[PDB]
Amino acid sequence: LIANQFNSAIGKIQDSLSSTPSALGKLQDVVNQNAQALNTLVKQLSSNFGAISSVLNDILSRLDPPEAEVQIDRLITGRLQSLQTYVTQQLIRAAEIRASANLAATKMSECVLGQSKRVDFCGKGYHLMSFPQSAPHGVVFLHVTYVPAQEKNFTTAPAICHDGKAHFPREGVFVSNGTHWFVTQRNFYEPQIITTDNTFVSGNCDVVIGIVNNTVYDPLQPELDSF
Amino acid sequence: PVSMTKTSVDCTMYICGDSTECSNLLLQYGSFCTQLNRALTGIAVEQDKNTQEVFAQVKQIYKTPPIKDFGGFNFSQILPDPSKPSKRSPIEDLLFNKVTAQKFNGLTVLPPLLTDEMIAQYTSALLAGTITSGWTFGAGPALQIPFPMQMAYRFNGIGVTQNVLYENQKLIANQFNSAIGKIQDSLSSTPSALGKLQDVVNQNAQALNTLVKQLSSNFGAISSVLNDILSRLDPPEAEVQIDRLITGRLQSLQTYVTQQLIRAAEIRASANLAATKMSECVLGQSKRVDFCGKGYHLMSFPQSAPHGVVFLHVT
Amino acid sequence: VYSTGSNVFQTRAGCLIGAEHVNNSYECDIPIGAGICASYQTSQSIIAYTMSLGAENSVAYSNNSIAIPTNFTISVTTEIL
């Protein structure tokens, strides 16, 4: 069953990534940003900045070396300012990408090579494992996780007073369907007969609120009585 | 801190306020104003992204039952009050009361995307889910559970047998109730604790104002007022003056936008920390030490604040 | 850029023209602000609406009621960095 659900999950991953073209947007725009920034840099070439013309040669081919240096000064001032703005922009986004890379490496060390108890650090649900995949300038994780479904209603109590003694579950919870009492683990319905072996005794039953009367099963008693 | 105020600056009418020739002369400088508008628009959408990613983690909207039978525990200071139309907790009302200009040259503010009432609606839904489901509802469908049962589960998480809880129930509840009241008094008394929010507000209320004062810098020009040159000069020297004016003001604007970008990056880092804290100290129980307060972690509850989030760690 | 006297809508963000206000509450499609989002739907025109934040649900709390699942699902999600 787990195998078939896993296969179905992988197939829907393939189909969902093949169908929706809008999933990879985080990988797209950054690339676009670079080109856009680069583009406007070359678009700053033909700005006159209040000087006579945007060609260096035409200023040189028409004006005098006692005169033209004012125009050249204007040109280099404007272009230099644009270039310094560019390096500021790129270096800030570089810091941003460094932040993302550190986050990705931490997810590499915790989701893949181990099994993290931190909720939603390895995707939604109870984490089981993950696999990495390479991507253009980036990484794509697949988190394989566990979720519950088909819950029901059950009636509970904190502890059970059998013989003047309080009984607490070793691991799990006491439940009742209305007629009998069972003990089960906290994430999957699996009732068991309430024994000594899955419980423990601590104190009497005159302090705990909400404690009910029931029997506990002695494993030793049918062995001792039949002998 | 969660987010900062989405400011927006018009380029041209900040620089060349109602002048055709000045706008024409700034058009010779290329495409700087487009870059500034794109930068501030990126910041403004980033703030809403941060706020939405911090608070919207819950698929449903939960609410409390009317019957307040929590084994003797009390939550009245943090549960929402239907008595005020300002449908919040009392503690959030202290948070609103503790935390506390002119629009003339394109220096506009935009309203945030998420209003404060529905911020309180997520806060109420998160509190209801925590107190009615344990940690299960962050992992699937919400599952009901008695409250002291799940408190016993969290003691079983930290290394104490659940035996300890049931035989010592009521005193714990008493201590818990007393503890909550102290926090309200601790917010009713100390004014200097919330500066971590307010400085952020001050760090927008300070720099912006200085920008306006750079409208009164000559930069070598005959005057700081545009219309006086235009009322006095013939354009082939008026351009020589206006060139100085726009160069100085454009440099100041570039300084402002660079500082805003750096601050916005720091606020985004703070928001990522807050989101991880929301996912870990609220939706579950962390084994990590001092990630959710001093001591072995039991619980935490969130409350809203103007541009901020406030956690109470129960340890 | 040119006016219409038909159907204005004064929200806290400002004055909206070209849309119809809707009494219902839907999910946010594109953000205008102050809780108000817009979309093209039905005849069909562009509408602006108060957001619906999620499907309302109230779990039945008790002091003696426990919910336990019986079945499970393996599910795989993707995440891109």
Side-chain angles (χ1 to χ4, degrees):
Chain A
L1 166 79
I2 295 175
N4 297 346
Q5 291 192 22
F6 192 79
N7 297 346
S8 304
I10 297 300
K12 265 79 78 174
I13 296 169
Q14 284 180 176
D15 300 0
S16 175
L17 274 185
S18 66
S19 84
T20 309
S22 165
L24 301 176
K26 313 194 53 53
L27 294 182
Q28 175 81 53
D29 51 353
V30 166
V31 175
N32 288 349
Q33 276 171 11
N34 280 3
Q36 174 195 236
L38 184 62
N39 192 15
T40 188
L41 263 292
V42 189
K43 193 57 66 62
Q44 294 295 134
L45 269 296
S46 82
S47 292
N48 290 316
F49 294 107
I52 178 166
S53 179
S54 44
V55 186
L56 310 186
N57 275 315
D58 290 331
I59 310 181
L60 290 179
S61 305
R62 288 180 290 109
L63 277 297
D64 312 329
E67 192 276 336
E69 69 275 16
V70 187
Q71 313 292 319
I72 302 298
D73 191 291
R74 193 76 60 71
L75 264 294
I76 63 170
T77 286
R79 290 173 173 180
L80 183 62
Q81 202 182 4
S82 284
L83 189 58
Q84 188 193 238
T85 300
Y86 181 50
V87 67
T88 313
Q89 295 297 109
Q90 272 287 113
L91 180 157
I92 290 174
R93 293 191 185 107
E96 174 69 15
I97 290 288
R98 182 219 309 118
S100 195
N102 287 342
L103 183 59
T106 305
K107 293 217 185 192
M108 191 36 78
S109 169
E110 304 201 5
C111 297
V112 173
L113 275 72
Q115 181 187 22
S116 194
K117 307 271 168 303
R118 307 162 50 181
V119 183
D120 292 2
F121 189 55
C122 297
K124 194 173 164 306
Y126 289 119
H127 177 232
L128 282 175
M129 64 183 73
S130 288
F131 308 113
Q133 297 292 281
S134 194
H137 302 337
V139 69
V140 170
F141 288 103
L142 316 172
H143 303 300
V144 183
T145 53
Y146 178 85
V147 293
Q150 285 82 17
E151 71 269 16
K152 285 172 62 177
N153 179 30
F154 302 94
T155 71
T156 182
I160 298 163
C161 176
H162 165 54
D163 209 9
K165 298 181 292 295
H167 294 73
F168 298 88
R170 284 290 297 273
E171 170 63 32
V173 70
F174 292 137
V175 290
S176 181
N177 57 6
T179 62
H180 291 64
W181 287 91
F182 308 102
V183 60
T184 182
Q185 58 179 349
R186 315 172 166 169
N187 263 310
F188 196 88
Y189 186 74
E190 180 172 322
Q192 292 176 298
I193 309 298
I194 304 187
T195 68
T196 300
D197 298 331
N198 46 6
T199 57
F200 73 100
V201 176
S202 180
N204 55 341
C205 58
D206 62 357
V207 190
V208 194
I209 178 67
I211 182 163
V212 310
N213 291 316
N214 205 79
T215 184
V216 297
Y217 160 74
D218 189 6
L220 189 52
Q221 200 56 257
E223 214 188 330
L224 188 153
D225 287 337
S226 171
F227 186 64
Chain B
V2 166
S3 63
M4 61 188 319
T5 81
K6 315 160 62 176
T7 177
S8 279
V9 179
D10 183 25
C11 193
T12 66
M13 158 287 287
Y14 173 80
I15 299 297
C16 303
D18 188 19
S19 180
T20 53
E21 54 274 10
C22 193
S23 64
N24 194 1
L25 285 183
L26 181 163
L27 265 188
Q28 207 177 8
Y29 271 69
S31 68
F32 284 147
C33 298
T34 65
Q35 296 177 237
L36 305 163
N37 287 123
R38 288 195 292 107
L40 276 296
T41 296
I43 298 312
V45 68
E46 181 64 32
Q47 298 307 302
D48 288 351
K49 180 66 71 177
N50 285 358
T51 302
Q52 185 180 5
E53 181 284 349
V54 168
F55 279 104
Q57 287 187 355
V58 164
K59 55 181 77 66
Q60 312 211 317
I61 304 295
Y62 309 102
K63 66 180 287 186
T64 187
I67 300 170
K68 311 305 203 69
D69 200 319
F70 294 119
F73 282 76
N74 194 4
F75 292 91
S76 66
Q77 312 279 126
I78 58 171
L79 281 177
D81 204 2
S83 312
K84 291 183 181 179
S86 181
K87 281 189 53 83
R88 295 196 303 251
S89 67
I91 292 186
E92 285 148 5
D93 293 332
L94 282 71
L95 288 197
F96 263 73
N97 292 340
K98 294 301 288 196
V99 172
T100 302
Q102 295 85 20
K103 45 184 177 66
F104 41 80
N105 291 76
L107 278 297
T108 63
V109 291
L110 278 74
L113 173 60
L114 285 178
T115 53
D116 293 358
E117 207 81 30
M118 64 183 72
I119 293 168
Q121 191 167 3
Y122 290 172
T123 302
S124 64
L126 269 159
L127 289 176
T130 296
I131 70 152
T132 52
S133 66
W135 67 93
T136 68
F137 85 112
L143 305 180
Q144 76 266 22
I145 184 172
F147 203 78
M149 185 64 72
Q150 76 95 29
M151 196 74 37
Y153 275 11
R154 308 229 185 201
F155 291 174
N156 202 3
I158 72 164
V160 191
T161 315
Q162 70 188 359
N163 187 202
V164 166
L165 177 136
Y166 287 131
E167 65 193 300
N168 303 308
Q169 186 169 317
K170 47 165 47 59
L171 282 80
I172 288 177
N174 300 356
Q175 290 196 107
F176 179 79
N177 299 348
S178 315
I180 289 286
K182 263 72 179 176
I183 283 304
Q184 193 266 351
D185 184 74
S186 176
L187 280 185
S188 180
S189 61
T190 300
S192 65
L194 273 75
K196 292 299 295 296
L197 292 180
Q198 198 91 60
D199 193 6
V200 165
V201 176
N202 292 350
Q203 279 162 8
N204 290 337
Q206 184 178 2
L208 194 52
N209 183 261
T210 64
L211 186 65
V212 190
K213 292 182 176 66
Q214 299 271 2
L215 277 296
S216 87
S217 300
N218 270 336
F219 301 108
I222 53 170
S223 173
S224 52
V225 179
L226 277 300
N227 294 290
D228 273 18
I229 302 181
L230 299 177
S231 81
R232 187 131 54 83
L233 272 299
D234 164 29
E237 309 90 1
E239 293 179 353
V240 181
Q241 314 284 277
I242 297 303
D243 197 357
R244 268 80 177 274
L245 267 185
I246 62 170
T247 294
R249 290 183 170 171
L250 178 63
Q251 186 178 22
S252 291
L253 188 59
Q254 177 141 320
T255 290
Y256 169 68
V257 61
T258 294
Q259 209 278 330
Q260 272 288 312
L261 277 170
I262 301 310
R263 280 206 182 108
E266 299 299 326
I267 293 284
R268 186 193 218 283
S270 173
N272 283 339
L273 178 62
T276 296
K277 285 227 183 197
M278 184 64 73
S279 294
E280 294 294 328
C281 305
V282 176
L283 258 62
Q285 184 182 12
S286 172
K287 195 52 211 73
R288 306 165 47 181
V289 186
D290 287 337
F291 201 46
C292 316
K294 190 180 173 299
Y296 306 133
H297 174 238
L298 279 178
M299 221 70 87
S300 189
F301 312 114
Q303 304 286 270
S304 45
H307 308 328
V309 73
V310 170
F311 301 104
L312 311 177
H313 296 310
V314 185
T315 60
Chain C
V1 65
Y2 308 131
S3 172
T4 304
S6 172
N7 48 3
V8 293
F9 188 32
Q10 176 86 42
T11 71
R12 188 167 293 177
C15 200
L16 197 65
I17 193 66
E20 276 314 308
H21 184 222
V22 164
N23 263 339
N24 291 318
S25 313
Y26 299 147
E27 267 76 25
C28 187
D29 202 350
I30 58 175
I32 297 169
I36 302 279
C37 299
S39 194
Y40 181 82
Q41 262 183 2
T42 192
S43 176
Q44 313 219 48
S45 189
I46 315 189
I47 56 177
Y49 41 83
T50 311
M51 294 182 287
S52 163
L53 273 297
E56 177 67 28
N57 182 24
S58 171
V59 62
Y61 177 75
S62 171
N63 76 326
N64 51 356
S65 190
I66 187 61
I68 292 175
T70 63
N71 192 359
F72 60 94
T73 304
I74 313 293
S75 75
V76 191
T77 60
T78 70
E79 175 158 42
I80 308 163
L81 282 72

